[PDB]
Design a protein around this ligand. Structure first.
Ligand code: NAD
Ligand code: 3LX
Ligand code: ZN
Lengths: 6, 298
């Protein structure tokens, strides 16, 4: 999984 | 197992402190973010006013988040490097909270520090590679982006590039040189996962400091701990609670709250206060004062 905002 | 015992005698900072000085608690993991470096002069992302997200109209930008996305960075690397010059601190001085973690290390309580920050302040405070997971990379090193040569450059080289306002290009192949940070849209470093699969099998306390817990998969770390692991948040504002509409996270307040603690304030103050209860206040004062003095003398 990758760097993601939320 | 998954039994949800109550290990702290009371959901307060004093309760955590007594737990930290009992025998059950021998491995501590810190999860930290940009809140712990704001008092070092590196601003937040999301904090209204201070945070970057309020302060970036000047960047010809179609989406205040795009300046940290890898896609946008591949197309137009200049705004990032322009932004990097603005923010580059004149002097690297880690905070009281940083030095609290070095005290953890010095007392054998630190199993790992997982940081979302890229400012290298954890290393300058004396946390070594064995103590650290730089989950989003770092400015400390940089690499040619060309798969064919990936030459490494030091921060000294990248700093002059940024301060001389010249886009960093590789001396061997003339491709772009990118700091070793994880952009939004990139894959976190392998070591993040190999540490996560092992560290959270026997952590005895989570210390969450200066993070809004809104970046994934970093925020998911708080749920990797076993259900009976006490979890302390030191932060301006509560964070990490499950959304009422959206395995979930922090539970400070509900009737079934049993291990989560929220100390609201400055990370430096909260670590100061925790250190007092532990009898480390003077020990923390001398260490910060000495290291700031050493750094101030450079
Ligand atoms: N120092 C850095 O390297 C830096 C700086 C800005 C952004 N970022 C990156 O952007 C993303 C933002 O994520 P984040 O959660 O770490 O930052 P954030 O902006 O999303 O939130 C920081 C949290 O810490 C609180 N806070 C700020 N200053 C504080 C202080 N002095 N004392 C106590 N609490 C304080 C804020 O209220 C907030 O809850 C991260 O992935 C990070 O990689 C890094
Ligand atoms: C993951 S969210 C990485 C975000 C990048 C943060 C940008 C930081 C600006 C550079 C600060 C310069 C300090 C050396
Ligand atoms: Zn190259």
């Amino acid at each position: 999984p990758r760097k993601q905002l939320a | 197992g998954s039994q949800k015992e109550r290990l702290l005698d009371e959901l307060t900072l004093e309760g955590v402190a007594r737990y930290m000085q009992s025998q059950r608690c021998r491995r501590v993991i810190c999860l930290v973010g940009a809140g712990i470096s704001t008092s070092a002069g590196i601003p937040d992302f999301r904090s209204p006013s201070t945070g970057l997200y309020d302060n970036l109209e000047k960047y010809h930008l179609p989406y205040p988040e795009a300046i940290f996305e890898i896609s946008y960075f591949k197309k137009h690397p200049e705004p990032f490097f322009a932004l990097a010059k603005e923010l580059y601190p004149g002097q690297f001085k880690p905070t009281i909270c940083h030095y609290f973690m070095r005290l953890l290390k010095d007392k054998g309580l630190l199993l790992r520090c997982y940081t979302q920050n890229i400012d290298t302040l954890e290393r300058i405070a004396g946390l070594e590679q064995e103590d650290l997971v730089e989950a989003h990379g770092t400015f400390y090193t940089s690499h040619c982006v060309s798969a064919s040569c990936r030459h490494e450059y030091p921060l000294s080289w990248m700093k002059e590039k940024i301060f001389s306002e010249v886009t960093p290009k590789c001396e061997d192949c003339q491709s772009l040189v990118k700091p070793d940070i994880v952009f939004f849209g990139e894959s976190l470093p392998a070591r993040f996962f190999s540490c996560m699969q092992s560290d959270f099998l026997k952590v005895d306390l989570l210390l969450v400091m200066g993070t809004s817990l809104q970046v994934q998969p970093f925020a998911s770390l708080i749920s990797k701990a076993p259900l009976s692991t006490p979890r302390l948040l030191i932060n301006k504002e509560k964070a990490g609670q499950s959304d009422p509409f959206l395995g979930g996270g922090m539970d400070f307040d509900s009737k079934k709250a049993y291990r989560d603690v929220a100390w609201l304030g400055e990370c430096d103050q909260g670590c100061l206060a925790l250190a007092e209860l532990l009898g480390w206040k003077k020990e923390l004062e001398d260490l910060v004062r000495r290291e700031h003095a050493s750094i101030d003398a450079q």
